[model samples]
Target: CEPRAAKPFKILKKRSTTSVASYQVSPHTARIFKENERLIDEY
Candidate 1:
């Protein structure tokens, strides 16, 4: 096997909001999801 310089490393931070659709019924669910995103951001 051949040896060479190591590949570059990439770091990432992924975040997702609530699965509930805003247009669907229960708008409150979506609202709660939005708050969840905020919490994740802070933590």
Candidate 2:
């Protein structure tokens, strides 16, 4: 069976477990990074 898109992993205490500050990137930056990598190309 194919995976469901509606559900996401780590439903509880996501920030407590792994923080954005630890990852060294903000949420907005991560989203923009994904959009740029998948939809927009830079050469």
Candidate 3:
């Protein structure tokens, strides 16, 4: 005779959440945020 299993296995799933925001700055001072804006855009 074979022994019975004691318990069943459980599986779990995970997901990532995303967010976004927008703003404006003067072209003259755009350089200050240029790198940051590029990174945000890429994200």
Question: Which pairs of residues collide in model 1?
Answer: none
lDDT tens digits, residue span 1-43, model 3: 9787789697887655865566777886887688789989997
Ranking, TM-score, top scorer first:
1, 2, 3
The prediction achieving the highest TM-score against the true structure is 1
- The TM-score, computed over Cα atoms with residue i paired to residue i, of candidate 1 is 0.39
lDDT by residue for model 1 (1-43), tens? 9777689677887656546545655789888998999999997
C-alpha lDDT score of every prediction, in listed order: 0.78, 0.73, 0.78
Number of colliding residue pairs in model 3:
0
- For model 3, what is the error of residue 11's alpha carbon versus the real structure, in angstroms, after optimal superposition? 75
Clashes of 2: 0
- Clashing residue pairs in all predictions, respectively, total 0, 0, 0
Per-residue lDDT of 26 in model 1: 73
For model 3, the superposed segments whose C-alpha errors exceed 4 Å read: 1-30
Evaluated at residue 20, the lDDT of candidate 3 is: 52
My TM-score estimates for the predictions, one after another, are: 0.39, 0.36, 0.27
- In order of lDDT, best first, we have 1, 3, 2
For model 1, the superposed segments whose C-alpha errors exceed 4 Å read 1-25
lDDT for position 5 in model 1: 62
